[PDB]
Amino acid sequence: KLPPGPTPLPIIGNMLQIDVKDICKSFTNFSKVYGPVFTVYFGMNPIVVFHGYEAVKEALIDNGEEFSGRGNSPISQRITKGLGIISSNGKRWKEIRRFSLTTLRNFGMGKRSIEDRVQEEAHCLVEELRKTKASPCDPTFILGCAPCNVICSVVFQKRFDYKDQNFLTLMKRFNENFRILNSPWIQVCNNFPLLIDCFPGTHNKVLKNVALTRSYIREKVKEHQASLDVNNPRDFIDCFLIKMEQEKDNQKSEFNIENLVGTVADLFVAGTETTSTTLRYGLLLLLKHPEVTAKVQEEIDHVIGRHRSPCMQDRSHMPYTDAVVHEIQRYSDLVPTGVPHAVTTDTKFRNYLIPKGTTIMALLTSVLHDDKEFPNPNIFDPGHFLDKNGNFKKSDYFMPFSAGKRICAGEGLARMELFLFLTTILQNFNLKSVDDLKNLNTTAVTKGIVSLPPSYQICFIPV
Ligand code: HEM
Ligand SMILES: CC(C)(O)c1ccccc1CC[C@@H](SCC1(CC(=O)O)CC1)c1cccc(/C=C/c2ccc3ccc(Cl)cc3n2)c1
Ligand SMILES: CCCCCCCCCCCCCCCC(=O)O
Numbered sequence: 104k105l106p107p108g109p110t111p112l113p114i115i116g117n118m119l120q121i122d123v124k125d126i127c128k129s130f131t132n133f134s135k136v137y138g139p140v141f142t143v144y145f146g147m148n149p150i151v152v153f154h155g156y157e158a159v160k161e162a163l164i165d166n167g168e169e170f171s172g173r174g175n176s177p178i179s180q181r182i183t184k185g186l187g188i189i190s191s192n193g194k195r196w197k198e199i200r201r202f203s204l205t206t207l208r209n210f211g212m213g214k215r216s217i218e219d220r221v222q223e224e225a226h227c228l229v230e231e232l233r234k235t236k237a238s239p240c241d242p243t244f245i246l247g248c249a250p251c252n253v254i255c256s257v258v259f260q261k262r263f264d265y266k267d268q269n270f271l272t273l274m275k276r277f278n279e280n281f282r283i284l285n286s287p288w289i290q291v292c293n294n295f296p297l298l299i300d301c302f303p304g305t306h307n308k309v310l311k312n313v314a315l316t317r318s319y320i321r322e323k324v325k326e327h328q329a330s331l332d333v334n335n336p337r338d339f340i341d342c343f344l345i346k347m348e349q350e351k352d353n354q355k356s357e358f359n360i361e362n363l364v365g366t367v368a369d370l371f372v373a374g375t376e377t378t379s380t381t382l383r384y385g386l387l388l389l390l391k392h393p394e395v396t397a398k399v400q401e402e403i404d405h406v407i408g409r410h411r412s413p414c415m416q417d418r419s420h421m422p423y424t425d426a427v428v429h430e431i432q433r434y435s436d437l438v439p440t441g442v443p444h445a446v447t448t449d450t451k452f453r454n455y456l457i458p459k460g461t462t463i464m465a466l467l468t469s470v471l472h473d474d475k476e477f478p479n480p481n482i483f484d485p486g487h488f489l490d491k492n493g494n495f496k497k498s499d500y501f502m503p504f505s506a507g508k509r510i511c512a513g514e515g516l517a518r519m520e521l522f523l524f525l526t527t528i529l530q531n532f533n534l535k536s537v538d539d540l541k542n543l544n545t546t547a548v549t550k551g552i553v554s555l556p557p558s559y560q561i562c563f564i565p566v
């Protein structure tokens with residue numbers, strides 16, 4: 104008894120009724136014809152889509168457990184092999200996530216807090232930006248090296264030097280796979296597996312980058328083993344190695360060198376491109392909206408000054424900069440469809456029964472753009488996260504990190520990098536448009552699962 108929906112054609116399903124590019128605009132129109140919940144078939148596979156705050160919440164939150172499964176697929180499977188945190192499910196997930204969540208706490212990796220790794224990075228970033236010499240440029244590459252280096256710093260103790268070859272290769276690697284896997288073709292090939300054979304070259308490249316990466320990590324993990332100081336862990340690998348030590352006897356324990364190379368890999372994948380995107384998107388918005396930046400720089404001056412580096416602690420005294428960072432995520436809507444889930448067993452959702460394994464889809468964007476909770480949801484405006492007094496106004500509708508039992512495993516780190524990197528930049532630079540702001544477009548290109556901001560150029564003018 105799946106929820107209603109467009110009756111499918113045989114063999115293909117509703118495919119030709121869904122714009123594979125902006126598949127969310129497609130879903131939104133379906134909702135106006137079948138309501139909050141509904142089923143669509145990609146190929147022979149059913150997919151029950153949830154639209155609106157109440158549907159997404161009732162599902163993800165209220166029925167948390169049953170909706171905490173990761174919808175998987177032919178591609179996702181052959182890349183990860185069910186290893187790691189993102190793609191795993193059941194027992195192996197719960198144990199890896201729980202270990203990951205606590206090991207990723209501000210101090211969960213030893214004497215050196217993560218904030219300190221982020222703050223040091225926000226530094227090198229500002230230094231690289233000075234190198235542009237105020238000249239117009241595409242911030243994409245520079246902005247990407249920071250979030251990627253933060254992860255390096257979190258899993259490999261030390262951060263790389265931007266010119267270091269290993270870092271550049273480590274990046275291209277992940278970027279290439281990011282671009283491949285973000286093609287509308289992925290949605291097709293995932294449902295019509297046979298069509299993967301039609302992409303020999305691309306198939307090999309993806310697997311090759313994945314293969315090479317695993318090697319590098321493993322080579323790097325041995326370095327950690329042969330130098331492990333059990334009493335004070337250096338990074339993420341140390342913590343895992345220590346945990347592995349304890350389970351030494353349990354032959355069915357998840358903590359083995361295999362999930363370690365996996366979970367590490369996942370960390371880059373899960374926190375590099377997403378952060379980089381929101382960052383690049385955030386600057387574009389601060390550029391397009393000058394009267395906004397001015398206020399943020401005003402808080403920065405008033406609460407941090409030119410006297411020192413911003414730290415997470417200032418955020419409690421900077422309501423506006425907080426509203427901005429919240430509105431940047433709400434507006435830029437990084438993952439409109441959220442990441443596909445799957446119900447854990449036969450699940451009951453008001454009048455409907457959803458078979459175990461079915462693919463779920465909680466449309467985050469439908470929440471982030473609720474027109475009642477956010478009047479004029481399509482205009483970037485910090486007011487959305489501000490009360491009549493200029494005080495921060497938290498929202499239950501703020502789900503860019505998703506919700507429920509499978510909410511972003513690195514939200515904190517994510518929120519920390521956005522606030523640090525963004526305030527640290529605005530402190531040392533002012534944003535200048537190569538052209539006229541009016542000629543500046545801020546509409547995303549959703550030719551894929553990860554919405555992207557339009558390409559642009561900017562001039563970092565040292566204050
Ligand atoms: C701009 C920043 C980021 C955003 C908006 C974002 C958001 C997301 C979203 C929407 C999900 C899927 C949640 C679901 O299952 O429904 C996710 C999960 C995940 N994120 Fe992020 N992310 C970002 C950065 C980070 C960072 C910096 C890390 C690194 C620690 C991280 C690691 C993860 C991991 C490991 C998962 C998979 C969790 C699981 O399946 O149990 N994320 N993220
Ligand atoms: C990548 C992204 C968008 O930043 C992200 C961030 C946080 C959480 C999820 C995601 C989506 C990652 C999704 S891509 C899903 C797709 C559809 C499907 O197969 O079901 C679009 C193909 C995903 C889910 C589970 C595991 C993975 C593992 C990826 C991975 C694993 C190891 C890798 C080693 C080297 C390289 Cl160069 C790339 C590697 N990539 C990816
Ligand atoms: C083991 C993992 C295999 C993954 C195979 C993924 C196959 C899908 C390849 C899609 C390639 C799309 C290339 C077109 C790029 C473009 O010009 O838009």
